[PDB]
Every structure is written in C-alpha cells, then in structure tokens.
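Continuing from yesterday's entry. The apo prediction looked reasonable, so today I'm repeating it with chloride ion included to see how the binding region is handled. Same sequence as before; SMILES copied from the compound registry.
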Amino acid sequence: MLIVPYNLPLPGGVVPRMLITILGTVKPNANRIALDFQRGNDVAFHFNPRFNENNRRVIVCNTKLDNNWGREERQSVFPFESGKPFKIQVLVEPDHFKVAVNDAHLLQYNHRVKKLNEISKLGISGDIDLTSASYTMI
Ligand SMILES: CO[C@@H]1O[C@H](CO)[C@H](O)[C@H](OC(=O)c2ccc(C)cc2)[C@@H]1OC(=O)c1ccc(Cl)cc1[N+](=O)[O-]
Ligand SMILES: [Cl-]
Ligand SMILES: [Cl-]
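Holo prediction written out below.
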C-alpha cells in the first residue's frame, strides 16, 4: 500500500482528456475520504465522502480560495462501503471534473478555478488503504 496522505504530482497541471484513477480499499469503521486537487495552497476541487454527518453518508464537494471554503455541492448517492475495494475515476472535461466510482457515473463539478494547468498536485487522504494512483491521457 502507498503511504496516506499521498501526493500525486500532476505535471503541467490538468487538461481536458486527462483521466486520474485511484484504487484503494476503505478501512473498517471509516469516517472520511478526501481528494484535493490543489493549485498551490488553493483547492480547486475537494471531493469528500463523509461516512457520518448527523448519521447520514454524504459526499461534499467544494473549492478553497485564499484559505476560504466556498459553497458546498452535495451528492446523496454514496457508493463507498467500509471494508470494500473501490475505483475512483476523475475525468477532466472542458467545463467540469466528471467522477465515476466502480464504473458508475457519480457526479460532475463545474470548474471554479480556471487555470487548469496550475492545478499541479492531487492530495489523497482519509480512511483508506491506497493501492495505486495514476493518470493517463484518453
Ligand atoms: C465545514 O467543514 C469543512 O468543509 C469543507 C468543505 O466545505 C472541508 O470538507 C473541511 O475539511 C477539511 O478541510 C479537512 C478536514 C479534515 C482534515 C484531516 C483535513 C482537512 C471541513 O469539513 C469538516 O471538517 C467536516 C465536517 C463535518 C463532517 Cl461530518 C466531516 C468533515 N470532514 O470530513 O472532515
Ligand atoms: Cl508511498
Ligand atoms: Cl483561476
């Protein structure tokens, strides 16, 4: 397993047609997972499965600019399960990030950070055993 939290450099930032694939297994009794696509200290796209927010499972998505979180976008479809292997695929499209989990479309997140080629790192954190993290151009 890779060491979490894990930084995946994205050389030259992201660009449409770039596919990021994360393979891992959720720990037992998980509380949270996070993917943070970063532009220096800013978070262009925060993808945050929460296993217990007032006894509900929810994925929260947001952007952090100058240390300030913005308006959350929330998804009640929740494909993750404590103890089970998952695949997250993040495809950069021209107007949004498109996210699929276990080969099923989950959500899309409109680009708030516009300088895509400056989103140069992906942080992977939370209650997972991380198997692999990679990218390819499709
Ligand atoms: C309002 O709360 C914030 O919302 C943001 C999204 O809008 C982030 O998700 C923040 O989290 C972190 O930036 C962050 C959190 C932990 C670390 C180890 C590093 C960074 C934080 O979320 C929680 O604290 C939170 C609030 C309620 C619940 Cl139930 C779960 C979470 N959470 O997953 O941390
Ligand atoms: Cl590692
Ligand atoms: Cl920008």
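Comparison notes:
- The pocket of 59O (ligand 1) is lined by residues 32, 46, 48, 50, 53, 60, 62, 69, 72 (CB under 6 Å).
- The domain at 6-137 is CATH 2.60.120.200 (Jelly Rolls).
Will overlay with the apo model tomorrow.
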